[PDB]
Structure 1
Amino acid sequence: FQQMGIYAVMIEKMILRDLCRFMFVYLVFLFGFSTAVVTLIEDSYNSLYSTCLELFKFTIGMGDLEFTENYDFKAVFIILLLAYVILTYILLLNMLIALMGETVNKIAQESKNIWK
């Protein structure tokens, strides 16, 4: 199916390229701020797994910004979360769309040849 075959090939190429380029950066930022936050908040989460999850949730639009109160240094904790949200949800996710836009402009013609 020509019109759909091209689209499927574009998906294949963008999965190979941009979800290595993106995911290295994203996992680096996420792991960094996860380890920072879980280092800080130590009295129910208190766990690198649960904090990695809760910081993941800011990317799908369900972060809380007050997912615990069991800590001191509340200014530090908020600064970490705001820095994470700004660097990841606002910047990097939108840069992803911009770069996929440019790469789509690049592989307009390559895809037809790949499909053939």
Structure 2
Amino acid sequence: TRGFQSMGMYSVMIQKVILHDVLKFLFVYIVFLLGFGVALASLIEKCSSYGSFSDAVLELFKLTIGLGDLNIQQNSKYPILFLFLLITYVILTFVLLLNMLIALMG
């Protein structure tokens, strides 16, 4: 699609946005993902849903893209603290960081 005129300007924007904004945003966002993934997988009392570190980050990525669930009834010792960490993560990335990325991409 570099042959036409109204398509090369759409095929170079992928390269510009990937090399400038999305990589920088992921280099920031991986820190929040790892921190809240360990912080949620630590306090789960063993037998549920937030099993290990290779599952809590999947649940958090679904929560960031807008899938999944946000159920309070988990097998934790402090469900108020668990809900507070989940609300802090959703406020930090679903509202602040992703829309700041959208403004920078604009």
TM over 0.5: yes
Segments of 5+ residues of structure 1 without an aligned counterpart are: 102-116
Which structure's relative contact order is higher, taking Cα pairs within 8 Å and 6+ residues apart? Answer: 1
- Aligned Cα root-mean-square deviation (Å): 1.3
> In proportion to residue count, which structure has more helix?
1
Structure 1 segments (4+ residues) deviating >3 Å:
none
Higher mean C-alpha deviation, range 2-11 or range 63-72: 63-72
Segments of 5+ residues of structure 2 without an aligned counterpart are: none
1:26 counterpart = 2:26: no
Larger radius of gyration: 1
1:12-91, aligned counterparts within 5 Å?
A: 12-43=15-46, 44=48, 45-66=50-71, 69-91=74-96
Corresponding residue to 1:98 among 90, 96, 103: 103
> Following the alignment from structure 2 to structure 1, what is the Cα–Cα distance between the partners of residues 11 and 5?
10
What count of residue pairs does the alignment treat as equivalent?
101
